[PDB]
């Protein structure tokens, strides 16, 4: 599943920031309620973030595995995978 979770848009789906340069950025948790090419808005108990792909590690619950995934791995804009 984890290479099936590349080749989807996240939406929908609870994800956490578990790596990045910005330390002020780990740990933020939540719902992605939009992707964007560069991007994940995520919806959090404390509201909206926004927090760049590149260069940052999500923890991603997906199909009932949670998993580590790099996001230069979905550094592209969801319809191009």
Request: net charge positive; aromatic share 6%.
């Amino acid at each position: 599943q984890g290479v099936e979770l590349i080749a989807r848009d996240w939406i929908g789906l609870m994800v956490e920031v578990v790596e990045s340069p910005n330390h002020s950025e780990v740990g933020i948790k939540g719902e992605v309620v939009d992707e964007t090419q560069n991007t994940l808005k995520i919806m959090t108990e404390k509201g909206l973030k926004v927090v760049a792909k590149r260069g940052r590690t999500f923890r991603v619950w997906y199909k009932g595995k949670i998993m580590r995934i790099k996001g230069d791995l979905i550094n592209f804009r969801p319809e191009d995978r």
